[PDB]
């Protein structure tokens, strides 16, 4: 496998680079960054080897500037971390330029898949898909995957059940228009509504903590790096091994809502997004989902 | 952890012993079998130590006949595999009684040494769990059997294959007897949290064929190689892992039920159960649709018959 | 990867099939057997999948008879377990020739299909490796045997247990015949890079009893449970993992020795080898002390006698 | 196990916190830092939990300031990362202050083993041993472990053999007074001198790069965070599981080697649940004894000048 991290100098980028360098399937990792980043990245690589300690002697790491993207050729996936820190529309445009440029350059080199993490992730995935000309199945963004994971952990801790028993999600925007799918939330297969303890669940407090998670972690340490990297590693594993798991990622929706990249349920595999799962949403859910889709169409 | 396998001389016992010795928490493994088996049980041990190749030097494996069960003291879990095989000329009741004597005697002897948790694999597993509980006098949380765990796993894998999704995305179960009275719970089956009944390929699910294959798996594998040993041992390994790490998972096991379902009482049957360090932490009660509860009560009656006949 | 176990219906064959099926580098596992075992193998397959419980969806397990060997094509390794047990009343030569027929015919057929590597488990492992390489027409780098790998592992674990160090710190070998003429190499035994001689406790080491047990293990385990199945399967798994990942470890295997040791030539015997994706990449040549080279000679002499009286059947 | 990382806000500290928190033998991890870093460390903890994604529910990470060390009680190991980025003496003394005070407070609160990551690691291990008053089997430092590992990987890459086949060690100071031990280097139990290709080995360039790695990575990214954290994790796993491996660490040496005396220096050691269970005594060749005694002299100088601050 050959993955290219564009923005490997970042926090999420370097965390994910180290995590991927350890997988047995990673054979050619490509760390890309602007020219002033090159030296820095050459250091990252150094340390990434110091950790492997000779275990992966068939592993190869490459460092190149964002000028000579010819090394991207034949990459299975290209993960884009490049972006700028925080008005909302101002940031949308500022980062849209970067991601559109990178997508355009990537498509010129090869027909690959694109994993967008930069924010606003849904609109950034829209811009990437447009400026790449790629098919709707080969471009996707992190979207509300991390928020859904946090929500799942919260529910599981409340109910005192193992993490694997809880299956839920949060579709919508990676923002405040989130739409928790309580209709598609189950414990061991049971709908959560058939538990009596569901009436005691602090729903608003949980969802508010999830909405504010980025704010809190920015206030404390200046941004999340480890957890996002772990989630991205898991998504890459879902792709390379053709695992066909039902994730929640920002994808192009058309009738499943239309002409918008929003956080929806998706079956991920070797061929990227193989399916956008369309399911019946209760009334409030579908209303709020439409609202989130409007806000996301804005940018 | 200190696990004891009574009947480790057998197929399932040997497989389970090998798989448990490989675990990082298995610090003392106790292999019990009748006296004529002692030498064989030593062989097993030797081979296991050959497989580890020194990777676990803190591991002790013991071999003792079923006469001197004092080596069981302080065991976390005692897995009972010892049992007689079904044969032509045996009614279901013949097997129930013949194996009830065995499991009941072993459970009474176990209770005489220590206060531990008993994991019944011997068949008819639901009835044998009932008998182990009766003769051991342990609490309703310390005795349980495999039951429909494996059948539920097979059903889950089948559904996942049909929908072409990862196995971890499918959550389903089969309650009732480890037998033809099985009751798959299609009401509490989901793919990614979505009920399967919302998917449009559900009307295309060959559910009848899947259920037939699950019910007949035992006969098929006995026809081919005389019995199942690898898969049952893997499932038992994961149940023991659920216990030792207090993972609090929602498994499907043969547990004692008293009212948690409508009209199920004084019976060991395959039900949903939250399993952790203290055994059966909870028997999950759930509203079954009309058909599910009708069939569940029928299976409960089938089990109650043999249970009544084996108590004394 | 795609491995083929020829004799999967046996103890070692089935244990190895189970262990290999769990590996994530196993896309195609091919279980071969005589026709009368096709259903037994099917049973095996079923049970294996049962134990996998749907974790491996891209994995495929095939079952076949030993007449349609076309399924063996593109296989990275072919393990040979097919072989007859020594029955009381069998001389060493008798077992040699009987199992020679089997391994040789399987090797010739393997060659007829495609070019692959051949991992001989069948005992007398050294002679069987010789016969397989004969009838395969393959290069010497693509045919090897388990040989004295297990015995070396047992010796190492014993030393480690006595010195109270982790297993990974001990680095020893036992070369030569997988038999009574074993050759423990105390000249090349170290504990933390430090030759075991330098350790004062090497005086107290019960060397003789340890080697006694290493040599008697076979009949000890045959007398109790009838034979070995777990340890050999684990060792075979390690060798296969070394091949697939080109780990380039220095193992101790039955390899063809052409003058790499003084006096040893045209014989398959237990030697140090550097194993990789291309098979035996190097037969490592090292300076034995006096007694060790003498014993290695004699062991090679015995193996050569057997390899000669059987080389044409 | 219950470990406590003093300096968890550092680079190495955070990397090690994340690696340890993933281990299943980690029931209680305690992240200690100065008061001004409290919020920061809290953030770290948050991130760590985010990376665990609910897998470790028996995991308990506690964050606290370096004033309320009461939480350190019952910790199996305490890893000290706190340090300052000057001459050599200047850094030695400045960090001796920090590590000595932390060792003394650790001793006040409870009894434990102290793993010194702070550099100059040999001198700092001496000062931890002093200000803690603990037994010598209880105070060690990373020392020349990483250097030995990089030397081993280089030999492995050259000879085209798996790393696990190479078994080498570098003893002495974590610095230019290093002493690569070619007398105790083997490749599969074969003395590497018996290999002919040893004569074509670029030995000196290898050793120079080993000496320069720290500065080289500091010239690019700021400092080492991942590799040191991995080696630390391996040493802690050897400690907790009583693995009985023969590592190369900074330990107190009292004549176990002919000439060495009252010096915390890098030597071969048998590590277990008891910390340094033994200093392995080896027969070195003339040149290696000479260089090792010189390294002892250097470290003794620094230790003498930082003995009472
Ligand atoms: N749930 C989610 O969807 C999550 C979203 N994210 C988002 O992903 C992005 C990455 O975050 P993080 O890695 O912490 O960010 P950092 O600020 O730490 O890294 C920024 C990266 O972008 C590059 N970069 C910055 N400005 C430009 C520019 N003008 N042109 C090109 N490249 C540029 C930097 O390169 P250089 O070294 O040259 O400055 C560096 O690679 C953020 O937008 C973040 O919000 C991440 C976490 C979670
Ligand atoms: N899904 C499920 O619930 C499964 C249930 N099972 C059941 O578990 C049991 C074990 O099966 P399996 O291991 O294949 O069977 P085996 O016959 O291979 O082994 C059972 C062991 O029981 C012991 N035993 C036999 N007779 C007696 C006796 N009279 N008194 C005491 N001990 C006796 C023997 O060991 P020793 O001589 O040392 O006492 C024997 O090795 C069976 O009843 C089987 O049906 C197994 C497979 C799956
Ligand atoms: N340390 C070592 O190197 C070890 C070596 N071995 C050796 O490996 C071999 C396998 O042992 P084990 O698995 O216990 O023995 P088994 O007899 O249980 O298995 C060997 C298989 O060979 C096949 N076979 C037997 N005769 C013939 C024949 N005439 N033609 C074709 N196939 C035949 C059979 O499968 P089927 O009927 O389907 O063909 C049989 O199951 C033995 O020779 C054993 O000595 C094993 C243990 C350790
Ligand atoms: N091979 C080896 O032996 C290696 C050793 N090291 C050594 O480990 C140490 C840590 O390096 P690194 O993590 O990059 O350093 P950082 O500066 O990134 O972190 C060290 C931490 O020390 C604390 N600190 C700083 N000054 C003081 C002070 N005056 N009093 C108390 N605490 C203080 C700070 O945390 P807070 O504010 O919370 O106290 C700071 O985060 C260095 O000395 C380095 O040389 C590093 C890697 C390799």
> Would strands B77-80 and B117-120 be described as parallel, antiparallel, or unpaired?
parallel
List, as one string, the DSSP characters of B137-197.
Answer: ---TTSEEE-TTHHHHHHHHHHHHHHHT--GGGEE--EEB-SSTT-EE-GGG-EETTEEGG
Give CA angle at D230 (D227, D235), nearest 5°: 130
As a whole number of angstroms, the distance between CA A166 and CA A189 comes to 8
Q: Do D186 and C169 touch (CB under 8 A)?
A: no
**Domain total for chain D?**
2
As a whole number of angstroms, the distance between CA B150 and CA B230 comes to 12
Q: CA of B217: how far to CAs of B224, B228, C16, in Å?
A: 11, 9, 24
**Six-digit token string for C244:** 């697939």
φ, ψ dihedrals at C189, nearest 5°: -110, 125
Q: Is B158 exposed, middle or buried (0-12, 13-18, 19+ CB in 10 A)?
A: buried
As a whole number of angstroms, the distance between CA D253 and CA D260 comes to 7
As a whole number of angstroms, the distance between CA A142 and CA A137 comes to 14
Q: CA of D187: how far to CAs of C144, D76, D152, D195, in Å?
A: 22, 35, 10, 9
Q: Which residue has the tokens 């009307």?
A: B203
Active-site residue (options: A131, A137, A174, A289): A174
> Would strands B60-65 and B28-33 be described as parallel, antiparallel, or unpaired?
parallel
How far does the CA of residue C212 sit from the closest CA of chain B (Å)?
16
Residues 6+ apart with CB under 8 A from B219: none
Indicate the residue among D141, D175, D193 that finishes a domain.
D141
How far does the CA of residue B164 sit from the closest CA of chain A (Å)?
7
Q: Do residues D120 and D86 touch, judged by C-beta distance below 8 A?
A: no
Whether residues B115 and B153 fall in one domain: no
Q: Do residues A36 and A246 touch, judged by C-beta distance below 8 A?
A: no
Q: Do residues A146 and A238 touch, judged by C-beta distance below 8 A?
A: no
Q: Do residues B46 and B19 touch, judged by C-beta distance below 8 A?
A: no
Q: Find, among D36, D102, D28, the residue nearest to D69 by Cα.
A: D102
- Count of pairs with CB atoms under 8 A, one residue in A, one in D: 106
What does the longest C-alpha to C-alpha distance in chain B come to? Answer: 59
Which residue among D46, D49, D213 sits closest to A220, beta carbon to beta carbon?
D46
Query: Is C313 part of a structural domain of the chain?
Result: no
The resolution in angstroms reads 2.8
CATH code (residue A17):
3.40.50.720
Q: CA of A94: how far to CAs of A79, A84, A263, in Å?
A: 19, 7, 22
Consult the annotation and say whether A150 binds a ligand. yes
B171 beta partners: B190
Whether residues C116 and C181 fall in one domain: no
As a whole number of angstroms, the distance between CA C191 and CA D245 comes to 10
Residues counted in chain B: 312
Whether residues C156 and C283 fall in one domain: yes
Whether residues B12 and B124 fall in one domain: yes
Technique used by the depositors: X-ray
Q: D146 CB under 6 A from ligand 4?
A: yes
Torsion angle in degrees (nearest 10) through CA of B247, B250, B256, B258:
120
- Quick count: other Cβ atoms within 10 Å of Cβ C64? 20
Torsion angle in degrees (nearest 10) through CA of B105, B108, B112, B115:
130
Residues 6+ apart with CB under 8 A from A171: A144, A178, A179, A181, A248, A262, A263, A264, A265, A289
Q: Do residues D248 and D144 touch, judged by C-beta distance below 8 A?
A: yes
Q: How far apart are the first and last CA of chain C?
A: 33
Helical spans, DSSP H, in D88-190: 88-109, 121-132, 145-159
Distance C6 CA to ligand 3 centre (A): 9
Torsion angle in degrees (nearest 10) through CA of B262, B266, B270, B276:
100
Q: CA of B240: how far to CAs of A54, B22, B61, in Å?
A: 35, 13, 17
Consult the annotation and say whether C7 binds a ligand. yes
> Would strands A77-80 and B28-33 be described as parallel, antiparallel, or unpaired?
unpaired
Q: Do residues D205 and A27 touch, judged by C-beta distance below 8 A?
A: no
As a whole number of angstroms, the distance between CA B12 and CA B227 comes to 9
**Six-digit token string for D79:** 């890893």
SS3 C14: helix
Indicate the residue among D91, D114, D141 that finishes a domain.
D141
Residues 6+ apart with CB under 8 A from A87: none
As a whole number of angstroms, the distance between CA C103 and CA C95 comes to 12
How large is the C-alpha radius of gyration of chain A? 19
Q: Is D265 exposed, middle or buried (0-12, 13-18, 19+ CB in 10 A)?
A: buried
Check CB contact of D42 with chain A, cutoff 8 Å.
yes
Quote the DSSP letter at residue B47: H
Query: Is C92 part of a structural domain of the chain?
Result: yes
Q: Do residues B27 and B2 touch, judged by C-beta distance below 8 A?
A: yes
Check CB contact of B248 with chain C, cutoff 8 Å.
no
Whether residues C166 and C104 fall in one domain: no
Torsion angle in degrees (nearest 10) through CA of C114, C119, C125, C128:
0
Helical spans, DSSP H, in chain B: 11-21, 38-52, 92-113, 125-136, 149-163, 207-225, 230-244, 290-311
The helix or strand, by DSSP H or E, that contains position D237, with its residue range, turns out to be helix D226-240
As a whole number of angstroms, the distance between CA B21 and CA B47 comes to 11
Q: Do residues B221 and B248 touch, judged by C-beta distance below 8 A?
A: no
Distance C232 CA to ligand 3 centre (A): 12
Whether residues B141 and B194 fall in one domain: no
Q: A226-251 burial by CB neighbour count: b if 16+ within 10 A, else e? A: bbbbbbbbbbbebbbbebbbbbbbbb
Whether residues C225 and C97 fall in one domain: no
Half-sphere exposure (Cβ direction) of C198: Cα atoms closer than 13 Å: 15
As a whole number of angstroms, the distance between CA D266 and CA A226 comes to 33
What is the Cα D59 distance to its own chain's centre? Answer: 25
- Quick count: other Cβ atoms within 10 Å of Cβ C144? 30
Q: Do B198 and A161 touch (CB under 8 A)?
A: no
Residues 6+ apart with CB under 8 A from D211: D147, D175, D176, D178
As a whole number of angstroms, the distance between CA C17 and CA B288 comes to 42
Residues counted in chain A: 299
**Six-digit token string for B197:** 């009944």
SS3 D222: coil
> Would strands A77-80 and A60-65 be described as parallel, antiparallel, or unpaired?
unpaired
SS3 B56: coil
Give the relative orientation of helices C207-225 and C149-163 as an angle to the nearest 10 degrees. 120
> Would strands D2-6 and D28-33 be described as parallel, antiparallel, or unpaired?
parallel
A180 beta partners: A170
Q: C121-135 burial by CB neighbour count: b if 16+ within 10 A, else e? A: bbbbbbbbbbbbbbb
B62 beta partners: B30
Residues 6+ apart with CB under 8 A from D244: C164, C165, C166, D238, D270, D271, D272, D277
As a whole number of angstroms, the distance between CA B268 and CA C292 comes to 66
How large is the C-alpha radius of gyration of chain B? 19
Q: C37 CB under 6 A from ligand 3?
A: yes
Q: Do A57 and C24 touch (CB under 8 A)?
A: no
Please state whether the peptide bond connecting residue D189 to the residue before it is cis, i.e. omega within 30 degrees of 0: no
Residues 6+ apart with CB under 8 A from C88: none
Give CA angle at C294 (C292, C300), nearest 5°: 100
Q: Which domain holds residue B48?
A: 2-145
Q: D141 CB under 6 A from ligand 4?
A: no
Q: Do residues D115 and D141 touch, judged by C-beta distance below 8 A?
A: yes
How far does the CA of residue C4 sit from the closest CA of chain D (Å)?
26
Q: CA of A120: how far to CAs of A259, A297, B80, in Å?
A: 17, 12, 57
Chains with 3 or more CB pairs under 8 A to chain A: B, C, D
**CB < 8 Å to A60, chain D:** none
* Closest listed ligand to the CA of A92: 1
Residues 6+ apart with CB under 8 A from C14: C8, C44, C229
Q: Find, among B78, B45, B38, B39, the residue nearest to B60 by Cα.
A: B45
As a whole number of angstroms, the distance between CA A95 and CA C116 comes to 53
CA pseudo-torsion sign D132, D133, D134, D135 = positive
Q: Find, among C266, A227, B142, C284, the residue nearest to D54 by Cα.
A: A227
CATH code (residue A214):
3.90.110.10
Residues contacting ligand 2 via CB (< 6 Å): B 7, 9-13, 33-34, 37, 81-85, 102, 121-123, 125, 146, 150, 178, 227-228, 232
Q: Do residues C168 and C192 touch, judged by C-beta distance below 8 A?
A: no
List, as one string, the DSSP characters of D33-84.
Answer: E-GGGHHHHHHHHHHHHHHHTTS-SS--EEEEETT-GGGGTT-SEEEE----
Half-sphere exposure (Cβ direction) of B113: Cα atoms closer than 13 Å: 21
Suggest the residue from D22, D31, D54 to mutate for an interface test with chain A (most A CBs closer than 10 A): D54
As a whole number of angstroms, the distance between CA A168 and CA A180 comes to 8
SS3 D86: coil
SS3 C269: strand
Whether residues D14 and D119 fall in one domain: yes
Q: Do residues B245 and B255 touch, judged by C-beta distance below 8 A?
A: no
Whether residues B162 and B293 fall in one domain: yes
Q: Do A168 and B286 touch (CB under 8 A)?
A: no
Q: CA of A4: how far to CAs of A236, B235, C121, in Å?
A: 12, 39, 43
Chains with 3 or more CB pairs under 8 A to chain D: A, B, C
As a whole number of angstroms, the distance between CA D91 and CA D211 comes to 18
Q: Do D57 and A157 touch (CB under 8 A)?
A: yes
As a whole number of angstroms, the distance between CA A13 and CA A4 comes to 10
* Closest listed ligand to the CA of D123: 4
As a whole number of angstroms, the distance between CA B223 and CA A150 comes to 48
Q: CA of C279: how far to CAs of A55, B127, C19, C282, in Å?
A: 20, 55, 21, 9
Quote the DSSP letter at residue B256: E
Torsion angle in degrees (nearest 10) through CA of B75, B79, B81, B83:
70
φ, ψ dihedrals at B229, nearest 5°: -135, -40
Residues 6+ apart with CB under 8 A from D154: D206, D209, D210
Whether residues C211 and C280 fall in one domain: yes
List, as one string, the DSSP characters of D6-43.
Answer: ETTTSHHHHHHHHHHHHSTT-SEEEEEE-GGGHHHHHH
Residues 6+ apart with CB under 8 A from B170: B156, B159, B160, B163, B189, B190, B191
As a whole number of angstroms, the distance between CA C208 and CA C195 comes to 19
Whether residues C289 and C153 fall in one domain: yes
Q: How far apart are the first and last CA of chain D?
A: 33
Q: Do residues C155 and C270 touch, judged by C-beta distance below 8 A?
A: no
What is the Cα C205 distance to its own chain's centre? Answer: 28
As a whole number of angstroms, the distance between CA A180 and CA A155 comes to 12
A36 beta partners: none
Q: How far apart are the first and last CA of chain A?
A: 34
HEC secondary structure over chain A: CEEEEECCCCHHHHHHHHHHHCCCCCCEEEEEECHHHHHHHHHHHHHHHHHHCCCCCCCEEEEEECCCHHHHCCCCEEEECCCCCCCHHHHHHHHHHHHHHHHHHHHHHCCCEEEECCCCHHHHHHHHHHHHCCCCCCEEECCCHHHHHHHHHHHHHHHCCCHHHEECCEEECCCCCCEECHHHCEECCEEHHHCHHHHHCCHHHHHHHHHCHHHHHHHHCCCCCHHHHHHHHHHHHHHHCCCCEEEEEEEEEECCCEEEEEEEEEEEECCEEEEECCCCCCHHHHHHHHHHHHHHHHC
Distance A229 CA to ligand 1 centre (A): 13
Indicate the residue among A141, A157, A187 that finishes a domain.
A141
How far does the CA of residue A51 sit from the closest CA of chain D (Å)?
4
Q: Do residues B236 and B119 touch, judged by C-beta distance below 8 A?
A: yes
Q: Do residues D137 and D249 touch, judged by C-beta distance below 8 A?
A: no
Q: Do residues B32 and B7 touch, judged by C-beta distance below 8 A?
A: yes
Whether residues B213 and B110 fall in one domain: no
Q: How far apart are the first and last CA of chain B?
A: 34
B5 beta partners: B31, B79
The pairs formed by A287-292 with CB atoms below 8 angstroms and a separation of 24 or more are A288/A172, A288/A177, A288/A179, A289/A171, A289/A172, A289/A179, A289/A257, A289/A262, A290/A257, A291/A177, A292/A172, A292/A173, A292/A175, A292/A177, A292/A178, A292/A179, A292/A262
> Would strands D61-65 and D28-33 be described as parallel, antiparallel, or unpaired?
parallel
A251 beta partners: A262
- Quick count: other Cβ atoms within 10 Å of Cβ A196? 8
Q: Do residues C58 and A242 touch, judged by C-beta distance below 8 A?
A: yes
List, as one string, the DSSP characters of C35-60.
Answer: GGGHHHHHHHHHHHHHHHTTS-SS-E
As a whole number of angstroms, the distance between CA C31 and CA C49 comes to 13
**Six-digit token string for C156:** 């190492």
């Amino acid at each position: 496998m050959k993955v290219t991290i564009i923005g490997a100098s970042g926090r999420v980028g370097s965390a994910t680079a180290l995590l991927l360098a350890k997988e047995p399937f990673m054979k050619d990792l490509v760390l890309i960054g602007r020219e002033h980043s090159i030296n820095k990245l050459k250091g990252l690589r150094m340390d990434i080897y110091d950790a492997l300690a000779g275990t992966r002697s068939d592993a190869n790491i490459y460092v190149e500037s964002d000028e000579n993207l010819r090394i991207i050729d034949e990459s299975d996936v290209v993960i884009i971390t490049s972006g700028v820190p925080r008005s909302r529309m101002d940031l949308a445009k500022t980062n849209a330029k970067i991601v559109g440029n990178y997508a355009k350059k990537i498509a010129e080199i090869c027909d690959t898949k694109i994993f967008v993490i930069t924010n606003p992730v849904d609109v950034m995935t829209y811009k990437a898909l447009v400026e790449s000309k790629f098919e709707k199945n080969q471009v996707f963004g992190l979207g509300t995957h991390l928020d859904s994971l946090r929500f799942k952990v919260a529910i599981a801790k409340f109910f005192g059940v193992h993490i694997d028993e809880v299956r839920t999600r949060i579709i919508g925007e990676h923002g405040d228009s989130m739409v928790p799918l309580l209709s598609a939330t189950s414990i061991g297969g049971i709908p959560i509504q058939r538990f009596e303890r569901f009436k005691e669940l602090p729903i608003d407090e949980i969802i508010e903590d999830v909405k504010t998670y980025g704010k809190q972690i920015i206030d404390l340490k200046g941004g999340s790096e480890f957890g996002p990297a772990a989630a991205i590693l898991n998504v890459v594993r879902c792709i390379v091994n053709n695992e066909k798991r039902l994730l929640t990622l920002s994808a192009y929706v058309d009738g499943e809502i239309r002409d918008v990249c929003i956080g929806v349920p998706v079956k991920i595999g070797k061929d990227g997004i193989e399916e956008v799962v369309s399911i019946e949403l209760n009334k409030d859910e579908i209303i709020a989902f439409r609202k989130s889709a409007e806000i996301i169409k804005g940018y």
